[PDB]
Symmetry: D2
Subunit: 413 residues, 4 copies
């Protein structure tokens, strides 16, 4: 039926869900259009997403479109139990997600999710799609297509394609302009610092903050860190973004040099073990480390636990590791996505554009069922452009249009 | 002997208090010296402050110095019930403060605090000091001196002085360099937006944020709103801060003109009725108003309650007022100091210096008992500068010092 | 032989050219490599570029590579006569460019340039390449390939391809990451405000500055304008960049609304008549207008001249137009690229990366002569990436490299 | 009767002077009132200022008020020869100032200015006032009062006062709100980088820029360096501005530590030998040093000239010193105020307020002749605030005013 924490939390989820609806006008139009055209009639669907108020508004949209939906958590700490309760209670959408569930339960929910025999799979981090490929080859005849929300999921699908196992259409939702130009940049920018502050109420001004990676997320995090008064260090593996950060006024250096200097560390690389044992040993006493990439494995907390003589919870979402010399390493959110673990995730304004993309990419998969080459597909430019047009309109912002003479001038050489 | 929500919240309170101390090293050195020298022996003290982790650390330092302290809330919505529980349970420090208490309860706590017969009064907004002078003229022999934490309190103290009723010393803690340069600016800047985001999780980037007042607080709020991607409008009544705001890149305009453009309004003026019905009437459907000045009277909420046909709670610390024509005004924290009502207030890093000023100001009053002129006193320059030196050192920052030749150059004029 | 203003200015050009060489280390290596491999042996070449100290350093690089080079001006006001003098005098490179030459002389230099019968044509704005196609079809057998420096030139080549007349390889230098991520953004950002300040010494802080277009140049100009204390308005025709500007803290609105509010206007669209007659009539008395797109036609100065009763020079590079009601419109640089007309153009740091691209794209054309499809070609990723690596090294900035385990993790799904 | 480079440059000078006036409307209203009331009738006046378009506009306004003025250069490298030509040719105003004059010529102009027997002295750095007090004690009966434009002059005036030799009124123009809040911060911020860029056309983005001193000037320079994409390091000697710089997001450290990291160094401290040989020795090959404090002595260039084996001019206003080990130090403007040596100085928009203070301060001295105590005087609050009001209005910016009810709230304390 469902697997949640407490069903009596539904009136709180419903409240917070509709509050978030106010800045999801684009997804409001698509759900309004879906309820009249029912694109997902007779379609079974799985979403593996962060159980937030925004994700609820997407599920409501696919529900209105006729989909038979089952939501599971993309992360044990991102789940909001009040919205998981409202979804089961007010819409009948089975949800298998409990805040702080153990890893046995996460995979038990994945097994429950695939037994839905989904036609569409919305994924975020590519966990269900990888499990489907590895354990349920017999279920591939059910797949019309899948979607992927986050950069880390797109990298794994690239390895699925190059391994020869991406034998179905996968909509690359994360790489749409209206997705990661905003979500990854502006959303992660604000909400990462939100999580750090809700966890610690630490003053960012006057601290050295080390941002690992200067991609979409890294640019946003460094920008908001600087905006909040911090001295920002950036690390990288690629020369083009490293030059960007330097010309943006940020200090670029190897992580081994930055480990001696940082007060707060924020990983947003998508890569494994970006903060390492040899980095913990030179960190300032009381240095704070956290992660805003999709998986917690950007920080080597395994090694940290073995290097430490004592660990202790000292505030919400905050652990103090004490080393044998008495120095302390602070870890927020157990290394999980700090914006989702220690706060509420992205404001709905950006998830409007993310889940507008998610909604239409699902519509795209069904509308072209049987006509898609296997492998990755981009969001059509017109869809991506129309989302931006609707969002701009909804922000109350008007811009210019070219005149017939301006159009003719572009075409002369 | 106290009046708190629930004393079983003490262990959470203790955990949060210990965390806050990690960025209060100046106050830790002061507390450690007070424990040895006992400057407050035989002194009864009343503190009217926001009952936060940072105030607890101040209370502890006063308690180490031998103070017989009693603590009450400076605002009904800023109280942290776990902090109040911990100070009572772990330290035996009487606390009369309940988060969300009505005004009758607040006024009763002031009377109870005055019944402590304080010798020193630490105030935040000057409620207790005003009530003492207004009602307890027979008690004024107790008073060694008082202190005042915030700008609005300093304004009330000036009006008391000009009335000829400030017949005892009052330490202007707010105006110390190491107080309002950092607390009022960098503290309010971060924690105001913190409160707004904890209340609504709204995206600040792309919103138009109207900041009423461009003093120490207004500069911090606009600074941080701009850092978070917002389009900032500043309103003012004085031309010097108005020009500063323009050359800092912000749009300056009268509030009647900002009223139809703002998505979020934040008042930090210290004045009354900064946002009025004629402003509510033209605001965008769904506009957010909140206040980070000391009192909620910066926004005319009483008129808004009368105009609206409905008010609903729509999120924690968030109310939706629906006007007769159907448009919505959104209020955070019932207009009370939003950083303290919807979040936790300033980070301890800045309260370290503000409350270092409070501790050294109380020591200043006792050591100079019977030697200070009545009226408002600035924090001694030596005290203010030494707080700055200790904080910089604790921040791990090193700077230069003048050579004898450079000192020789300054005193020259030929 | 050449067509310059004054040959006795050579010692001043040589001085300023080598000063600019200090922050052109990447182009230093390529010229050093070219002098040993002589990629342009027996090759005739034309450059139509801004006659600046940086352009001189590029010409020196192609000279060292064996090229028989002839430089002409891309704009009458961008020419620095001291560097035009040093090129003819110290290297023997014929130059036909005179600061403030009339439009008869510009085209007379273009006719002189094509009579060189070039094998390679480096262009900036696509003027010589368009004239070659239109008037010298008989010379197309000489073309191994061409290059294009600026966004406006790429748009014209797109119209040349779509018209069916781009019958040769054209290297798209402008769109390399190391080109327009820096040049167009950071270079135009600083040097546009440099031109405005050298022209007027006006305080930017406290002024409303209107930036037309939020592309690479627009993002840089708005960023530096804000950094200098200005209230920034942005105009656009496309929803995605318009949302970017809003979420960057800038006010986005139609130009017709911004015309009432701006103190300084800066066009960087690449399009025609972005500031119009109906905009001049509502501008504040004393409003300043200038252009940093490639052609002056972004502002309709033709109409401004007819609407005005009087025009008057009031400072260097600065004209005052007085309207019949007495209000004034200030025009800087006659509407030409204000960074080049009123100052010196981009600092050499960015032109290092631009002309490194220019150098190698020319080497690319000859190394693959006869093996290139007709039409536009991008800078090879490896070239673009190697430039960034060399520049980062030369800035003294070190970054990280993935470990073998980090590489293996990326490849698992 | 004057001493200028070339009087044929007057028409260029006149064009630049008229342009500068377009953003000097407060001074234009003052000039227009002076033309009517002639406050300076029968007054001889000496001005020691940077001979710029903005100073010319001030000189014109003084000339309209009837002043018999004589102008000399405050610095050998800040003089604009076309301005000096115009003031002499068009206005008959004696100017003794040549751009790049040696020190003998400078000192001779001071003697010539003192021979004018001034009644009012407008000074910029206090050279003339110091020389008057040191050498012309028999002349002090002439003096109605003097003014001082800049922070270094105020420091010298304080040292004169503490010596007991400041026996006449001296108006502190620098410290007026409408002066150092905008001129020293927003003016120096823009024009310092302007000077650097006009000298070198170097890309500021990605460079490490070391700003010595975080006062009014230092805040502006760091602010604008950061706005232009630079990585900013701040050095200091006092903890209060040091903490501010950190909470503004800058790296604070001793100069010995910044010396090996900076690409560009800018001194705005008012102190002597802020950059020393032990700093030159560890600087990056090719590092830029320059100064925007009043005197060039902030950088120990005399030691650098001794250490270096060669010095070459490599660009306008740009010298390359080559040390014995072959590494280069680059100096802009010979260490003189780089905004004024390599560019044009502050935009007129801010000098409008600074020089409005100069004009109203000279009027203040004359109207109060024989009524002021000797020593340093602040600009009257009424004058300072009225300059701010007029500038805001001229900037087209409108703000709010207090209702009677809000005034009633401020005076209340109950
Ligand atoms: N927490 C959130 O709300 C949220 C939202 C969106 C994306 N994400 C996650 O954030 C991560 C980054 O996504 P993105 O959009 O920024 O990706 P991206 O591809 O645009 O950028 C990642 C950057 O990190 C750099 N990098 C990689 N390995 C590195 C290393 N070892 N050290 C330093 N730099 C390194 C890359 O060169 C690149 O510039 C992904 O895991 C993504 O799923 C999180
Ligand atoms: N919430 C917090 O944690 C916190 C912290 C410190 C102070 N405060 C409070 O914030 C308020 C402001 O303090 P401050 O230090 O900024 O004071 P301030 O004296 O430095 O500046 C206040 C500014 O408001 C302006 N102003 C006054 N009335 C105005 C009006 N009607 N419209 C627009 N502008 C107006 C003044 O001209 C001045 O520039 C006070 O009530 C103070 O007690 C709150
Ligand atoms: N002056 C310089 O030193 C310099 C350097 C590089 C490029 N440029 C020139 O600057 C111009 C812009 O180049 P870019 O790299 O920014 O190009 P771009 O393609 O990256 O961006 C141009 C932007 O302008 C917008 N735009 C187009 N027409 C518009 C209109 N009528 N109103 C408002 N916005 C409009 C487009 O939507 C786009 O976002 C080109 O002409 C280019 O050649 C100048
Ligand atoms: N170039 C211009 O146009 C212009 C304009 C105004 C003032 N000035 C000059 O700029 C200088 C600074 O003026 P201001 O208004 O900023 O003064 P200020 O009093 O506001 O600040 C000077 C700062 O320098 C710091 N400082 C002093 N010695 C130092 C040292 N050895 N190392 C580091 N920091 C040190 C002080 O602690 C202080 O914070 C003065 O010489 C003034 O006359 C120049
Ligand atoms: N965390 C906090 N703890 C105690 N007082 C606070 C806190 N944050 C702000 N304040 C104080 O509250 C006053 C406003 O009433 C300000 O002057 C400020 O110093
Ligand atoms: N454009 C200018 N004209 C005249 N004086 C100037 C100019 N720019 C800066 N100054 C002044 O020079 C002083 C420094 O000697 C500063 O106090 C400042 O007011
Ligand atoms: Cl749609
Ligand atoms: Cl102490
Ligand atoms: Cl190479
Ligand atoms: Cl006046």
């Amino acid at each position: 039926k469902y697997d949640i924490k407490d069903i009596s939390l539904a009136p709180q989820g419903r409240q917070r869900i509709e509050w978030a609806a106010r800045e999801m006008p684009v997804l409001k139009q698509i759900r309004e259009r879906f309820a009249q055209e029912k694109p997902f009639a007779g379609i079974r669907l799985v979403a593996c997403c962060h159980v937030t108020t925004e994700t609820a508004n997407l599920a409501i949209a696919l529900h209105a479109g006729g989909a038979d939906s089952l939501l599971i958590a993309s992360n044990p700490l991102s789940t909001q139990d009040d919205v998981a309760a409202c979804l089961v209670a007010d819409y009948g959408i089975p949800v298998y997600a409990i805040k702080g569930e153990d890893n046995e339960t996460y995979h038990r929910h994945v097994q429950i999710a695939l037994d839905h025999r989904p036609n569409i799979i919305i994924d975020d981090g590519s966990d269900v799609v990888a499990t489907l490929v590895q354990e349920r080859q017999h279920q591939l005849s059910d797949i019309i297509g899948t979607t992927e929300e986050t950069t880390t999921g797109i990298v794994r699908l690239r390895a699925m394609f190059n391994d020869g196992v991406l034998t179905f259409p996968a909509m690359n939702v994360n790489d749409a302009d209206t997705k990661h130009f905003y979500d990854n940049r502006y959303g992660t920018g604000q909400s990462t610092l939100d999580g750090i502050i809700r966890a610690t109420n630490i003053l960012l001004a006057g601290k050295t903050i080390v941002v690992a990676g200067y991609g979409w997320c890294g640019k946003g995090v460094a920008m908001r860190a600087k905006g909040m008064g911090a001295d920002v260090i950036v690390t990288e593996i690629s020369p083009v973004p490293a030059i960007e950060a330097a010309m943006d006024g940020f200090r670029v250096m190897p992580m081994a040099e930055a480990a001696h200097q940082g007060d707060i560390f924020i990983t947003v690389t998508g890569n494994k073990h970006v903060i390492r044992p040899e980095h913990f040993a030179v960190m300032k006493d009381g240095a704070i480390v956290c992660n805003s990439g999709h998986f917690d494995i950007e920080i080597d907390l395994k090694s940290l636990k073995e290097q430490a003589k004592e660990v202790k919870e000292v505030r919400n979402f905050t652990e103090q590791y004490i080393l044998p010399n008495g120095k302390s390493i602070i870890v927020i959110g157990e290394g999980r996505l700090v914006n989702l673990a220690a706060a509420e995730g992205h404001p709905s304004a950006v998830m409007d554009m993310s889940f507008a993309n998610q909604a239409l990419a699902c519509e795209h998969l069904v509308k072209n069922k049987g006509q898609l080459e296997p492998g990755m597909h981009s969001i059509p430019v017109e869809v991506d452009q129309e989302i931006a047009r609707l969002k701009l309109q909804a922000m109350g912002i008007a811009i210019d249009s070219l005149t017939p003479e301006q159009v003719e001038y572009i075409n002369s050489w």
